[PDB]
């Protein structure tokens, strides 16, 4: 029940704004923790969002006049009206926790223990428009059938911008699923993969549905993965 | 020392002799605390609610 859930994801264009949200469940945000860690894979990170309510002088000398945010305690949800979003802010944030000093966890000590996070949202600020992903069913081959374990999937290719989420059989296939991250093309396009190692006897008899979802473009494709039936 | 002798018997001129006074007292030059090396914290949140 107690969980931080990110919501309010959509497409942002240069000159526009969007209202993000981190909703706590179980514990009310009136007397709880919220730390907005901004992560870019491979490099260092930064904690930026300075909103501890009461509205006094506490800010960081890097985002002056850019990140504006409000407080709503009783609703157990916080909204992030991140105005003037720059195109160089491609990162998935996480609202998290900390530890102070008051209660039984610390009677003598300092604190500072981020311990409960969210799952993040996928918001891309791109000058160009969003494009629907192209799903190409990668069919099993003769070697996969004769090898005992068949490899099949559906390549998501030439979609801009991110993201694309691939699920199998609407959650009815979990064993062997492995998702290969998107590639950065020279032209800026993306291509990811999702391969599940299935029994070779289930080819044709068991239907293989891959659900490809792209939220900013609002496209859902339920692609069928079929064997090579010439 | 003569002042206490004069004001002890509640007069000014006192007859020749010797009289009882207070006794020497030593002010403590230090006040030390001696406790064992204990760092563990009593869990009272589990005790209260």
Curated annotation (Swiss-Prot), chain B:
Residue positions the entry lists as glycosylated: 29, 31, 37, 49
Start and end residues of each stretch annotated as Disordered: 25-41
Gene designation per UniProt: S
Chain's role: Attaches the virion to the cell membrane by interacting with host receptor, initiating the infection. The major receptor is host ACE2. When S2/S2' has been cleaved, binding to the receptor triggers direct fusion at the cell membrane. When S2/S2' has not been cleaved, binding to the receptor results in internalization of the virus by endocytosis using host TFRC and GRM2 and leading to fusion of the virion membrane with the host endosomal membrane. Alternatively, may use NRP1/NRP2 and integrin as entry receptors.
Parent-protein start and end of this portion: 295 to 343 of 1273
Species: Severe acute respiratory syndrome coronavirus 2
Protein name according to UniProt: Spike protein S1
UniProt-reported outcome of changing residue 37 to Q: Reduced viral infectivity
Quaternary structure, from the entry: Binds to host ACE2. RBD also interacts with the N-linked glycan on 'Asn-90' of ACE2. Cleavage of S generates a polybasic C-terminal sequence on S1 that binds to host Neuropilin-1 (NRP1) and Neuropilin-2 (NRP2) receptors. Interacts with host integrin alpha-5/beta-1 (ITGA5:ITGB1) and with ACE2 in complex with integrin alpha-5/beta-1 (ITGA5:ITGB1). May interact via cytoplasmic c-terminus with M protein. May interact (via N-terminus) with host bilirubin and biliverdin, thereby preventing antibody binding to the SARS-CoV-2 spike NTD via an allosteric mechanism.
């Amino acid at each position: 029940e107690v969980q931080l859930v990110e919501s309010g994801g959509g497409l942002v264009q240069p000159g526009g704004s969007l209202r993000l949200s981190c909703a706590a469940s179980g514990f009310t945000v009136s007397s709880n923790y919220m730390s907005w860690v901004r992560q870019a894979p491979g490099k260092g990170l930064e904690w930026v969002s300075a909103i501890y309510s009461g509205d006094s002088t506490y800010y960081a000398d890097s985002v002056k006049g850019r990140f504006t945010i409000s407080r709503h305690n009783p609703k157990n949800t916080l909204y992030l009206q991140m105005n003037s979003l720059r195109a160089e802010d491609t990162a998935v944030y996480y609202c998290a926790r900390l530890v102070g000093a008051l209660t039984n966890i610390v009677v003598s000590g300092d604190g500072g223990a981020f311990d409960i996070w969210g799952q993040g949202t996928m918001v891309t600020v791109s000058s160009a428009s969003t494009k629907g992903p192209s799903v190409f069913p990668l069919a099993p081959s003769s070697k996969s059938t004769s090898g005992g374990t068949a490899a099949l999937g559906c390549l998501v290719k030439d979609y801009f911008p991110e993201p694309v989420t691939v699920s199998w059989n609407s959650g009815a296939l979990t064993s062997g699923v492995h998702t290969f991250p998107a590639v950065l093309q020279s032209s800026g396009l993306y291509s990811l993969s999702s391969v599940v190692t299935v029994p070779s006897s289930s080819l044709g008899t068991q239907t293989y549905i891959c659900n490809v979802n792209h939220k900013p473009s609002n496209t859902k494709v339920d692609k069928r993965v079929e064997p090579k039936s010439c | 020392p003569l002042s206490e002798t004069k004001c002890t018997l509640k007069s000014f001129t006192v007859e020749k002799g010797i009289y009882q006074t207070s006794n020497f007292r030593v002010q403590p030059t230090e006040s030390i605390v001696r406790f064992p090396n204990i760092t563990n914290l009593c869990p009272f949140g589990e005790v209260f609610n």
